[PDB]
């Protein structure tokens, strides 16, 4: 990727990912609006299970979109499974995509409307491996999507705001070990599932999305320190990292299935 531009700039964003990424018209993308109305309960779905007891993380980095707070998915730890999953997916990555206010940020939207901010866990599917030949897979990747709102602080979350200091530029990195993914999830595991693709470029349809259906609440102070972010790199023109979310894509030939009637 050492020749991408694709950005969320005004002459690089979404509306422009298709020259190089024609698969951002195709038939799975993502994200995607959830009509609550339409989504129909599934009672097949098994409950979904969330293992992140032994979770180990190592670091945190700015790769210019967002920031990824990244994980030892070298053994058997942090895996998602059940739920509309056959297999075990291993956690490898978290990071969030948000606004510039907080009446907008989130990919997905629930009846047309967007949270503050989107927080995405990535798994890949440990029958392929690894996750560069996953994500080349149709059922490659697991993403537990979860909603952001602005009101009380998440205590969980504050580890993640107060390093961001030193890694306020694109290519900035930071020891980030003995984060606990756990610390930000919302009580209930009730979600949507759909099938679909990576929100960003390469926009491979490799992705089943599991999107939680309760948001978690994270404070005004606590997002106020995301948008102090850069998509820039140190020594470069300043460019706040805000609105880095993709908006909704085509649902097609898609059906979104609830696991709670
Ligand atoms: N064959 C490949 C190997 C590695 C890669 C990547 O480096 C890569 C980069 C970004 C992503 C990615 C992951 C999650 C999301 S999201 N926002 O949908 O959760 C977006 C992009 C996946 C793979 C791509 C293709
Ligand atoms: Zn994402």
Redesign the pocket.
Known sequence: ?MSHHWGYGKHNGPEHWHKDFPIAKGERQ??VDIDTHTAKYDPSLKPLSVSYDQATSLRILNNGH?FNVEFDDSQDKAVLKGGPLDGTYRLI?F?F?WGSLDGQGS?HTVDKKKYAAEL?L?HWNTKYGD???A??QPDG?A?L?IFLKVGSAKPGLQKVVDVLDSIKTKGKSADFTNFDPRGLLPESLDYWTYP?????????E??T?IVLKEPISVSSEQVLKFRKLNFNGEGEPEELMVDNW?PAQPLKNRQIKASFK
């Open positions: 990727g993502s994200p967002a990555q990071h995509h990919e995405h990535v996750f560069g030949k994500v080349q990747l993403v999507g679909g693709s990576l929100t960003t470029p390469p926009l491979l490799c992705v999305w993709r």
